[PDB]
CSV table of N, CA, C and O in Angstrom, one decimal:
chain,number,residue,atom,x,y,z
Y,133,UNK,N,-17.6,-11.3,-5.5
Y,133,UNK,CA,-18.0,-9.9,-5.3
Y,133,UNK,C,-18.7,-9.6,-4.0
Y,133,UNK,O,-19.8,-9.0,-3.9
Y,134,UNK,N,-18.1,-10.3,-2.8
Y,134,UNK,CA,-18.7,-10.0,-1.6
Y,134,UNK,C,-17.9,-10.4,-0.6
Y,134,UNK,O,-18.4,-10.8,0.4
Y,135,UNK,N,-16.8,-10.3,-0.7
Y,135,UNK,CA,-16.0,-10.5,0.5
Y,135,UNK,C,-15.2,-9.1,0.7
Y,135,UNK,O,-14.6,-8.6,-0.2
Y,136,UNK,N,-15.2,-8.7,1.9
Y,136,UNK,CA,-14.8,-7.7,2.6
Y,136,UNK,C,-14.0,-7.6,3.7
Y,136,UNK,O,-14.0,-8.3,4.7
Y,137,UNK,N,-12.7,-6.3,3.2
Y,137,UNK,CA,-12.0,-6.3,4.3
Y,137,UNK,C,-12.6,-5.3,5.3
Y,137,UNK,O,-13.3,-4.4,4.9
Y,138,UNK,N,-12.2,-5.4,7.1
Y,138,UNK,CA,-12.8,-4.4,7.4
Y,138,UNK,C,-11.5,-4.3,8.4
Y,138,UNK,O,-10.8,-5.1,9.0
Y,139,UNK,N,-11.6,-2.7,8.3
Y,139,UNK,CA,-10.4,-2.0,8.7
Y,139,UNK,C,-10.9,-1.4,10.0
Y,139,UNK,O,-11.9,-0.7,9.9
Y,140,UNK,N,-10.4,-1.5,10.9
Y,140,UNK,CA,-11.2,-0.8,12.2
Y,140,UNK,C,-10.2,-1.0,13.5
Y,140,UNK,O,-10.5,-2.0,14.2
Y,141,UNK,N,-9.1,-0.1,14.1
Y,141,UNK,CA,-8.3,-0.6,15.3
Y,141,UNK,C,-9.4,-1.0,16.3
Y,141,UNK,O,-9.1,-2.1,16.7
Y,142,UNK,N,-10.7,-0.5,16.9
Y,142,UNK,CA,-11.6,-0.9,17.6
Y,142,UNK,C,-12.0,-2.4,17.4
Y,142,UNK,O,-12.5,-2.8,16.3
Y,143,UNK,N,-11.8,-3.3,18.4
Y,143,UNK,CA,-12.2,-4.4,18.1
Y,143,UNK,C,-14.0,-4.9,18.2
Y,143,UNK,O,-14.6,-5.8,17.6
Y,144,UNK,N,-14.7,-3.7,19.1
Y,144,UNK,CA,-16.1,-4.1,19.3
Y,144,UNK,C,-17.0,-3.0,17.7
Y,144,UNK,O,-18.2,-3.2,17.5
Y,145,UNK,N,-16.4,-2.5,17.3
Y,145,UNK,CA,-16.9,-1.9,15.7
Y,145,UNK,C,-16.9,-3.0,14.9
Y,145,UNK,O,-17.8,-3.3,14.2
Y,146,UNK,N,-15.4,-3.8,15.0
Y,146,UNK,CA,-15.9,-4.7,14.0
Y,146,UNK,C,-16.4,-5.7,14.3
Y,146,UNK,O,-17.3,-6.0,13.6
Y,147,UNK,N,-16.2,-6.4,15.2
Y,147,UNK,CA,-17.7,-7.5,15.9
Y,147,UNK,C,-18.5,-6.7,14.9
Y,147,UNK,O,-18.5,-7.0,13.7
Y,148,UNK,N,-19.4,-5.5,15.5
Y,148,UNK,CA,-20.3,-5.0,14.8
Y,148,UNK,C,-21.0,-5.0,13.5
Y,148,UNK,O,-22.1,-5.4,13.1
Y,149,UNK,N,-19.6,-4.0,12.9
Y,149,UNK,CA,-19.7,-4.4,11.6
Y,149,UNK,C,-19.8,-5.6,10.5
Y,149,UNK,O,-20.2,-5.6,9.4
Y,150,UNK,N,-18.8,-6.8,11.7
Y,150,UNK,CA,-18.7,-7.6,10.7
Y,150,UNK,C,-20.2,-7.9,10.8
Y,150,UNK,O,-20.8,-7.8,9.8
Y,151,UNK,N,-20.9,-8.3,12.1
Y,151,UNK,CA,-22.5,-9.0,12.4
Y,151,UNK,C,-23.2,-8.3,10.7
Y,151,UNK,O,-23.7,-8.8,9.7
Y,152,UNK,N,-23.0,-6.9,10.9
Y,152,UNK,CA,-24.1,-6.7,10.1
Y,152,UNK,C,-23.8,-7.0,8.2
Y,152,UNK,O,-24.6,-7.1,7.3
Y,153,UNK,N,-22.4,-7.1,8.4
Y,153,UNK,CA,-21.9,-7.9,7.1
Y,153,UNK,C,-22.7,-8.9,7.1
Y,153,UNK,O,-23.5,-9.0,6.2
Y,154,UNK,N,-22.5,-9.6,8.0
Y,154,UNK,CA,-22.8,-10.8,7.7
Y,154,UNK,C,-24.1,-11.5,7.4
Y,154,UNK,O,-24.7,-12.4,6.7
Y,155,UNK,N,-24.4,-10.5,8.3
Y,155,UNK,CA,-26.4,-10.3,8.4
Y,155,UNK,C,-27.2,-10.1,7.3
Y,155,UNK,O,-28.4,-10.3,7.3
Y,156,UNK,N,-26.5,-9.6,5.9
Y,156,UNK,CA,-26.6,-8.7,4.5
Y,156,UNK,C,-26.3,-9.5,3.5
Y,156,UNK,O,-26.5,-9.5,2.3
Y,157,UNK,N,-25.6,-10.6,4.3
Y,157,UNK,CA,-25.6,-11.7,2.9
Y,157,UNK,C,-24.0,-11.2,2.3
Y,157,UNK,O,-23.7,-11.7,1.2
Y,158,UNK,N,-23.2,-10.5,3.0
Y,158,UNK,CA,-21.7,-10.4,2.7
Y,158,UNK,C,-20.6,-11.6,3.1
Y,158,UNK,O,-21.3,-12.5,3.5
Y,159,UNK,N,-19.4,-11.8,3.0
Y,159,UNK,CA,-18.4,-12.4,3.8
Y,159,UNK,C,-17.4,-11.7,4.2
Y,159,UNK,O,-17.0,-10.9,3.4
Y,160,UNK,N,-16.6,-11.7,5.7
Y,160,UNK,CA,-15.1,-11.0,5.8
Y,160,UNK,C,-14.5,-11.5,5.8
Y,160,UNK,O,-14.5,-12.3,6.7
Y,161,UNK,N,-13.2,-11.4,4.8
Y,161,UNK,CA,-12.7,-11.8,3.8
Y,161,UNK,C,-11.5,-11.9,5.2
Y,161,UNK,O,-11.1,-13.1,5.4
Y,162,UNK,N,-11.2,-11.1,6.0
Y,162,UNK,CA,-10.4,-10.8,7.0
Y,162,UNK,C,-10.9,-9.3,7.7
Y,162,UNK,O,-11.9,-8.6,7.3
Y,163,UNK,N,-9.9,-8.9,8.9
Y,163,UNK,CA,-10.0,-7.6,9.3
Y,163,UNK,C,-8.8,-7.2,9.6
Y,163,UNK,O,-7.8,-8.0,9.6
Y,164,UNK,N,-8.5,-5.8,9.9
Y,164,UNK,CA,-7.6,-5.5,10.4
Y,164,UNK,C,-7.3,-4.0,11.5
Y,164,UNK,O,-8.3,-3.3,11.8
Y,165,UNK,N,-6.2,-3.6,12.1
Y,165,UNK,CA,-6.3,-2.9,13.0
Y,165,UNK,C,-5.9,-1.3,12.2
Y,165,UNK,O,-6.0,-0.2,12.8
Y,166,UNK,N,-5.4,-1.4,11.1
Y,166,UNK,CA,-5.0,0.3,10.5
Y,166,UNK,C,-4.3,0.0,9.3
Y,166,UNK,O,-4.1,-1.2,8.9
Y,167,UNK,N,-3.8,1.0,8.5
Y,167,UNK,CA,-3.8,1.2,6.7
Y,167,UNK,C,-2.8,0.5,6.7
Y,167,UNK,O,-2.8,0.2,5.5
Y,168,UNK,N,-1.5,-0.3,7.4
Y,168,UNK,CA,-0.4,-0.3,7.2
Y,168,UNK,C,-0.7,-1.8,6.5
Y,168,UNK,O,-0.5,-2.0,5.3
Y,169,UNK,N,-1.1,-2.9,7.6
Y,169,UNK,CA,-1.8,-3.8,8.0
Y,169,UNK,C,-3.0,-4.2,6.8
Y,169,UNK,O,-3.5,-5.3,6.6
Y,170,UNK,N,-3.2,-3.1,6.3
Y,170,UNK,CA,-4.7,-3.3,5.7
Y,170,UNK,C,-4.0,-3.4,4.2
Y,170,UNK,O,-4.7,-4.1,3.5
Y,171,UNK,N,-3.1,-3.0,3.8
Y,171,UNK,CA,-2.5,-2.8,2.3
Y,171,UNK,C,-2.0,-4.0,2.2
Y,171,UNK,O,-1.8,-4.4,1.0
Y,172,UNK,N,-1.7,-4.8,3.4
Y,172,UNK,CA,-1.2,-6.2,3.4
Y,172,UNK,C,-2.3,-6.9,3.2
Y,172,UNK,O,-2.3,-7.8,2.5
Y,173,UNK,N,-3.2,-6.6,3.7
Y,173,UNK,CA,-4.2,-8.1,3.8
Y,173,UNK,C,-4.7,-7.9,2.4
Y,173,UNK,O,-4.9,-8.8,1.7
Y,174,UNK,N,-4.8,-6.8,1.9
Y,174,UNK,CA,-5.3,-6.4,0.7
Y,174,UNK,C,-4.6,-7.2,-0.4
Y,174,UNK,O,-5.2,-8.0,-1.1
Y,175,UNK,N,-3.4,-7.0,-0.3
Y,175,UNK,CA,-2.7,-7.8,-1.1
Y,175,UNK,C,-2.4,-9.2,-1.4
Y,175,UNK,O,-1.7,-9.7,-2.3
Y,176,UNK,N,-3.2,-10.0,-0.2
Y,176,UNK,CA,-3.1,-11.3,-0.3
Y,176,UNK,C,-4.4,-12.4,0.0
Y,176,UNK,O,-4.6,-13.6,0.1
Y,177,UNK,N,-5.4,-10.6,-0.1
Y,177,UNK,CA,-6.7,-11.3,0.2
Y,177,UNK,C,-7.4,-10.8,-1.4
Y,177,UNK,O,-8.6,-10.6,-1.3
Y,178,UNK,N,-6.9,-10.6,-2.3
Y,178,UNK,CA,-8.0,-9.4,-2.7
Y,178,UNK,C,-9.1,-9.4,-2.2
Y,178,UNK,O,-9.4,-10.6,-1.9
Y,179,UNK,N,-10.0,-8.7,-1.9
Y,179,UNK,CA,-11.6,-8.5,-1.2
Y,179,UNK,C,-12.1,-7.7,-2.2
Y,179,UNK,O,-11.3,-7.0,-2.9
Y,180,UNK,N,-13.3,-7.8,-2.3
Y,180,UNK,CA,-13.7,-7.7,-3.1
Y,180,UNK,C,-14.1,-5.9,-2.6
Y,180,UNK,O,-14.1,-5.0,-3.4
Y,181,UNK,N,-14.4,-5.7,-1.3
Y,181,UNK,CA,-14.5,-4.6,-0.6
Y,181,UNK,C,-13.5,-4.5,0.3
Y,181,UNK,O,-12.8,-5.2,0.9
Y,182,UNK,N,-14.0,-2.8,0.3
Y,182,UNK,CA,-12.7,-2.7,2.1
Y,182,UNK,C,-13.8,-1.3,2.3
Y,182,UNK,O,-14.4,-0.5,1.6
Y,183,UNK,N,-13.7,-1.8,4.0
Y,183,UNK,CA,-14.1,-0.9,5.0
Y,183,UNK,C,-13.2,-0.2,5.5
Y,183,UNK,O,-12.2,-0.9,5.6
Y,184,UNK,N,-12.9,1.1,5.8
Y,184,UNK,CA,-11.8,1.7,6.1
Y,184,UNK,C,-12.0,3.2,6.9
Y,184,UNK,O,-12.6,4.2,6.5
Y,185,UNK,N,-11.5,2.9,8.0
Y,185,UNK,CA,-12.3,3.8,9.4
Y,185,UNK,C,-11.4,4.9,9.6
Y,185,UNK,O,-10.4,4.7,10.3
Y,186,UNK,N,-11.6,6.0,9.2
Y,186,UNK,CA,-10.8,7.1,9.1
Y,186,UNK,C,-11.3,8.2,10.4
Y,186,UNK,O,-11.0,9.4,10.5
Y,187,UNK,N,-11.9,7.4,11.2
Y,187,UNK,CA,-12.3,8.4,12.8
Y,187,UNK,C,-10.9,9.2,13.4
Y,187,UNK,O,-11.0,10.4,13.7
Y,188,UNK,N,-9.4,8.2,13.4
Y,188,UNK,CA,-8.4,8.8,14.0
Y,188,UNK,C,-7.5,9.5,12.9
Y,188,UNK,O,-6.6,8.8,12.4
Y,189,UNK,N,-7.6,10.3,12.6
Y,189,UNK,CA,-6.2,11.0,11.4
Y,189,UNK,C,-5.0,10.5,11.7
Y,189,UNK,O,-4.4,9.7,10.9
Y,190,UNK,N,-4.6,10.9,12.7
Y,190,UNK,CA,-3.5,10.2,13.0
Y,190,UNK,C,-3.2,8.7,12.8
Y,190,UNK,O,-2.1,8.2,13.0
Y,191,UNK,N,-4.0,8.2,12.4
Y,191,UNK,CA,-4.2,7.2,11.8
Y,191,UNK,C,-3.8,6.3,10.8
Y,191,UNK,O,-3.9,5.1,10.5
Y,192,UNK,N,-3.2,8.1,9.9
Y,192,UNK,CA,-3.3,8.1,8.5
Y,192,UNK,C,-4.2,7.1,7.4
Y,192,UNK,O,-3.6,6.8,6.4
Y,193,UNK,N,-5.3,6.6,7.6
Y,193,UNK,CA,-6.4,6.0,6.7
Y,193,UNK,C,-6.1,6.5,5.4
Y,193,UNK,O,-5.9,5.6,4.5
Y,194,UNK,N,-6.2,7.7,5.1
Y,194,UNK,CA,-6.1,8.1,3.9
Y,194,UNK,C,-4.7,7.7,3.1
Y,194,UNK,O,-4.6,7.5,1.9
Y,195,UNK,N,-3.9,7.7,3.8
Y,195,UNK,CA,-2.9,6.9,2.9
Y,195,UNK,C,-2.9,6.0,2.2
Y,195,UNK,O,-2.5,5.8,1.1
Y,196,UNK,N,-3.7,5.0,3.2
Y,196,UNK,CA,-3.4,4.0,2.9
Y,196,UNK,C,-4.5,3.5,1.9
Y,196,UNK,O,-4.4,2.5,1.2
Y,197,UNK,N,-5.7,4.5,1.8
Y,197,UNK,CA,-6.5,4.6,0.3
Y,197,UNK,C,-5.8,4.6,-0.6
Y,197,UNK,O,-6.0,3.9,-1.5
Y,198,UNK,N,-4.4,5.9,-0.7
Y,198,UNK,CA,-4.4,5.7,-2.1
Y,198,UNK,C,-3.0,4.6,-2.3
Y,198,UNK,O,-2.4,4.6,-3.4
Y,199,UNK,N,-2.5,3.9,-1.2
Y,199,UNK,CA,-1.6,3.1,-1.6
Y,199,UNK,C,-2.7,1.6,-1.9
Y,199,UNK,O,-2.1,0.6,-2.3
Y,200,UNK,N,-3.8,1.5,-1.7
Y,200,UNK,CA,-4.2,0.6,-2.2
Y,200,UNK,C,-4.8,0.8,-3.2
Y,200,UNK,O,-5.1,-0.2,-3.8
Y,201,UNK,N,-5.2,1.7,-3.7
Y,201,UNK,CA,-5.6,2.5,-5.7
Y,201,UNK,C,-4.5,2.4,-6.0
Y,201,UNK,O,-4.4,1.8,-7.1
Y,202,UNK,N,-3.2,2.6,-5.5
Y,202,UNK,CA,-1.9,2.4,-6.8
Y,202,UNK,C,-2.1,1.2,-6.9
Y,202,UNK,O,-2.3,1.0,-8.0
Y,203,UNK,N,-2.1,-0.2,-6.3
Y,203,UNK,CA,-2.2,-1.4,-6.2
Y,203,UNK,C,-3.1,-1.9,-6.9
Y,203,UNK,O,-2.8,-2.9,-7.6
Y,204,UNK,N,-4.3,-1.4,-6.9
Y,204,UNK,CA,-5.4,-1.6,-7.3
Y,204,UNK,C,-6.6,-0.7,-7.6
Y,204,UNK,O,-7.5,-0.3,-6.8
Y,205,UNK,N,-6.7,-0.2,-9.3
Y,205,UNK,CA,-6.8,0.9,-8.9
Y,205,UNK,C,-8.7,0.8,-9.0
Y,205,UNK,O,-9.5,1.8,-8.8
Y,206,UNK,N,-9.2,-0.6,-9.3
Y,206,UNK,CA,-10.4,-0.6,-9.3
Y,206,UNK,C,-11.0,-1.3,-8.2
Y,206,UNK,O,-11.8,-2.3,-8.2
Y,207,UNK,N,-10.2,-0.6,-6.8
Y,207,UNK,CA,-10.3,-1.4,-5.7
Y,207,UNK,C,-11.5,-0.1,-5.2
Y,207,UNK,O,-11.4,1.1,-5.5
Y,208,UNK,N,-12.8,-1.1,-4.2
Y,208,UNK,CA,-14.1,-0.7,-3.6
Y,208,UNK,C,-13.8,-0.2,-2.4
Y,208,UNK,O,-13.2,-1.1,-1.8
Y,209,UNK,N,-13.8,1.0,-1.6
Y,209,UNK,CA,-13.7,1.2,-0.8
Y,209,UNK,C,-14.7,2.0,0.1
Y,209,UNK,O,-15.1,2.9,-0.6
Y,210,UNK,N,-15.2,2.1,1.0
Y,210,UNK,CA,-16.2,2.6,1.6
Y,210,UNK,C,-15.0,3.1,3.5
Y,210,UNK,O,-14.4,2.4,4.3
Y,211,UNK,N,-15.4,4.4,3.3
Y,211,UNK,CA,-14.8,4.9,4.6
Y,211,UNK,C,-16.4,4.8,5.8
Y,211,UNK,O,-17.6,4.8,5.6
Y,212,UNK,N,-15.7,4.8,6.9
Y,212,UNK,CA,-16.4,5.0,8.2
Y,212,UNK,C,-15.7,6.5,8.8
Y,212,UNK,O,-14.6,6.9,8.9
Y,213,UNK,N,-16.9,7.0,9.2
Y,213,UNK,CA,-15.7,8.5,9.7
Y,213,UNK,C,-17.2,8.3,11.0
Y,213,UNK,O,-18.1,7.5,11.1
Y,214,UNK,N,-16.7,9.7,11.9
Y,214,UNK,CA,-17.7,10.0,12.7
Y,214,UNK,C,-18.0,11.2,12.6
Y,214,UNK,O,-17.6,12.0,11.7
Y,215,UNK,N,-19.1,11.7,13.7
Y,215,UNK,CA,-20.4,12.5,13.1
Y,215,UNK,C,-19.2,14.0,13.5
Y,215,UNK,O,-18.4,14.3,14.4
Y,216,UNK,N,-19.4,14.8,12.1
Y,216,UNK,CA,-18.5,16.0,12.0
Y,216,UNK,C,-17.2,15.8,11.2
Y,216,UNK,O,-16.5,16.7,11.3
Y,217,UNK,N,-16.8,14.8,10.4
Y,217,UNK,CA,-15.9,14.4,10.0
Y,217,UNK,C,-15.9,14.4,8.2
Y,217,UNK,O,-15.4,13.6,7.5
Y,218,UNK,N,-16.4,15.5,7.9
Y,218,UNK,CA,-17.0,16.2,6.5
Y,218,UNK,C,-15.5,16.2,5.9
Y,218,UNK,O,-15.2,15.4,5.1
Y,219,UNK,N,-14.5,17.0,6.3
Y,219,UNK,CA,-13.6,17.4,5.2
Y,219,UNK,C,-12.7,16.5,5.4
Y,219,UNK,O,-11.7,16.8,4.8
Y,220,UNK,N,-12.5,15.1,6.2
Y,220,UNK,CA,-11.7,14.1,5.9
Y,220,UNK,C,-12.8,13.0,5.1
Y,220,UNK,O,-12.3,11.8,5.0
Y,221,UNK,N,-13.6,13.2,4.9
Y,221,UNK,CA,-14.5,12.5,4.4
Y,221,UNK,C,-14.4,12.9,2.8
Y,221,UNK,O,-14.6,12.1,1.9
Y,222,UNK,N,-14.0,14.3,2.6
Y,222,UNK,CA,-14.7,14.8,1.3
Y,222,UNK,C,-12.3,14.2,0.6
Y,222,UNK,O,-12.1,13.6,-0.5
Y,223,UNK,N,-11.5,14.5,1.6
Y,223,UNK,CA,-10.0,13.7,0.9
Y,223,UNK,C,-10.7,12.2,1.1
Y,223,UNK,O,-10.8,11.8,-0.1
Y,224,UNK,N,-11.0,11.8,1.5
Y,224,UNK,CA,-11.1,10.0,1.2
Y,224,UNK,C,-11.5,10.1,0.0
Y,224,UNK,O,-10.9,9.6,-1.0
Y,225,UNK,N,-12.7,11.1,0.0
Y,225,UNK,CA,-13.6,10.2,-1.4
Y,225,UNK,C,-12.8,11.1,-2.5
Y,225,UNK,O,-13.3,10.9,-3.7
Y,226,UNK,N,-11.7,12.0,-2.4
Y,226,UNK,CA,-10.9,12.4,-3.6
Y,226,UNK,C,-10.3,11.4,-4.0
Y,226,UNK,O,-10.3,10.9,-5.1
Y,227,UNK,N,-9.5,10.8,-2.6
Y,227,UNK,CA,-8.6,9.6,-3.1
Y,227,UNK,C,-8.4,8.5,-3.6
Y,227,UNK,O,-7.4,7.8,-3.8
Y,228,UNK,N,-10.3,8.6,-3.8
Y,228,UNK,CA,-10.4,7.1,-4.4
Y,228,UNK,C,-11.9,6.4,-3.9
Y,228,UNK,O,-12.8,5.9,-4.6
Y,229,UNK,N,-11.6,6.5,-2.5
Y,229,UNK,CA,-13.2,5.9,-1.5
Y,229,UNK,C,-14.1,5.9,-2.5
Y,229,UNK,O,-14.0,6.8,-3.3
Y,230,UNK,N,-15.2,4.8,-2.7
Y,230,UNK,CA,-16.2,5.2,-3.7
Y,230,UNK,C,-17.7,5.2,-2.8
Y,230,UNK,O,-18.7,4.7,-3.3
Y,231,UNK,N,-17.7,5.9,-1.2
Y,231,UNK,CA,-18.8,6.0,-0.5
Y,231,UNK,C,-18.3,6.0,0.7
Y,231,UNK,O,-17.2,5.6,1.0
Y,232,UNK,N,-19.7,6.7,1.9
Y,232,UNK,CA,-19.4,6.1,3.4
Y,232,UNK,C,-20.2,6.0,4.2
Y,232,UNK,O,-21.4,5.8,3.8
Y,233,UNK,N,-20.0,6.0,5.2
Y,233,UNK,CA,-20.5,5.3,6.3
Y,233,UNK,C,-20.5,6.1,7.8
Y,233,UNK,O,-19.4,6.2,8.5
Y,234,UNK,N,-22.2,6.9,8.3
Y,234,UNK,CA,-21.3,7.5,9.4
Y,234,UNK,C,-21.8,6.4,10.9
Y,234,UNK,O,-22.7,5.6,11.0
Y,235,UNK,N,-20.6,6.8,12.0
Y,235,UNK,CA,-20.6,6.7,12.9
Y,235,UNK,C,-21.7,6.6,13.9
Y,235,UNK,O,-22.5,7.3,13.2
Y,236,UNK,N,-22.3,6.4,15.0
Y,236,UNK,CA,-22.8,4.8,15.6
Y,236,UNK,C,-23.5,4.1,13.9
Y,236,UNK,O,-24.2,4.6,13.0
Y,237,UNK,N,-23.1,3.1,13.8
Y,237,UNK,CA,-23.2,2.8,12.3
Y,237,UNK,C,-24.6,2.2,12.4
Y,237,UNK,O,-25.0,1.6,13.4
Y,238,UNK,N,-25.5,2.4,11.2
Y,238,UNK,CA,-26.8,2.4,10.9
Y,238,UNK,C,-27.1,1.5,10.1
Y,238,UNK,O,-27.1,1.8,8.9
Y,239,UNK,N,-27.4,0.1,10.6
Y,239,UNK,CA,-28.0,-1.0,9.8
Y,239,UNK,C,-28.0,-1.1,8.2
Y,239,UNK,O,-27.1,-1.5,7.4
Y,240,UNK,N,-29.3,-0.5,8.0
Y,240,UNK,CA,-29.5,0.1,6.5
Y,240,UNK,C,-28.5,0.9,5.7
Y,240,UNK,O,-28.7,1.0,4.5
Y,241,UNK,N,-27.7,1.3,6.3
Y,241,UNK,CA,-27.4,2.5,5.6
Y,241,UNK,C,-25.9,1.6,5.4
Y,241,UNK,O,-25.2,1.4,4.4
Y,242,UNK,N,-25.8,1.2,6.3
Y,242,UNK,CA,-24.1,0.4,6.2
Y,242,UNK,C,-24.6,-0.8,4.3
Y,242,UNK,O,-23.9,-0.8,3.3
Y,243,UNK,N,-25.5,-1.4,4.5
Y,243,UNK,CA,-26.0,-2.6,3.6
Y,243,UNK,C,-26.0,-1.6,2.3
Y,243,UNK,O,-25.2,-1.6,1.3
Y,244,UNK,N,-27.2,-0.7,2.7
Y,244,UNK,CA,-27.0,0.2,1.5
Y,244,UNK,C,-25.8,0.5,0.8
Y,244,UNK,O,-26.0,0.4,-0.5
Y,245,UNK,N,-24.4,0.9,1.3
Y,245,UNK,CA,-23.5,0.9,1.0
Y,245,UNK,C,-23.1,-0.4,0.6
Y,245,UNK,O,-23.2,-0.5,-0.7
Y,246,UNK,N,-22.7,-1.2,1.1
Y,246,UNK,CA,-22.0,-2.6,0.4
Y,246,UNK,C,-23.0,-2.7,-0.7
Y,246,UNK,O,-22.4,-2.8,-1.8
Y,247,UNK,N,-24.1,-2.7,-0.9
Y,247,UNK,CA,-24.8,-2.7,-2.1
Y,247,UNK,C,-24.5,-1.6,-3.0
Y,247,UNK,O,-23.9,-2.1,-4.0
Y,248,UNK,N,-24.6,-0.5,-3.1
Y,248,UNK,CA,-24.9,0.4,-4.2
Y,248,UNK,C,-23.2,0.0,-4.9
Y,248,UNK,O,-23.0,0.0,-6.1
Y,249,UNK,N,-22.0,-0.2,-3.6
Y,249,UNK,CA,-20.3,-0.2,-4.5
Y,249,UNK,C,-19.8,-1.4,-5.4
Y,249,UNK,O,-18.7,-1.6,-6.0
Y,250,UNK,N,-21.3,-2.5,-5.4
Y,250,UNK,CA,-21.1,-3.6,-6.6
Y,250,UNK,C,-21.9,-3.5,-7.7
Y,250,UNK,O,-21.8,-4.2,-8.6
């Protein structure tokens, strides 16, 4: 119950991210660059969590929430969006997300999260 995927095409976010995973007493389980990619690792990683960065729409993030709830439908997910990013935030957490995370990402608040979704 601590291993985490983190989804992020940005490679210096997840440096980031992972540090402060890791800093919290988490593991990453793997990472990846976008949903397509991420439904894969999902599938052969199960993780216990997934980080999932919905900053680009174009992106389509949100799909790939709910192709990993059909998969898995008691799969942990926590989105990353950035600051203004309210009504793709409010479809994540329809689709399944069970929390998030805003943008320049905040120590506490990131942990906070990985904690409150176990």
């Amino acid at each position: 119950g601590k291993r985490v995927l983190i989804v992020d095409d940005a490679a210096f976010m997840r440096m980031m991210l992972k540090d402060i995973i890791t800093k919290a007493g988490y593991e990453v389980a793997g990472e990846a660059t976008n949903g397509r990619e991420a439904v894969e690792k999902y599938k052969e990683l199960k993780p216990d969590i997934v980080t999932m960065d919905i900053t680009m729409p174009e992106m389509n993030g949100i799909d790939a929430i709910k192709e990993i709830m059909k998969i898995d439908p008691n799969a942990k997910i926590i989105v990353c969006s950035a600051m203004g990013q309210q009504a793709m935030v409010i479809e994540a957490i329809k689709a399944g997300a069970k929390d998030f995370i805003v943008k320049p990402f905040q120590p506490s608040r990131v942990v906070e999260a990985l904690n409150k979704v176990s």
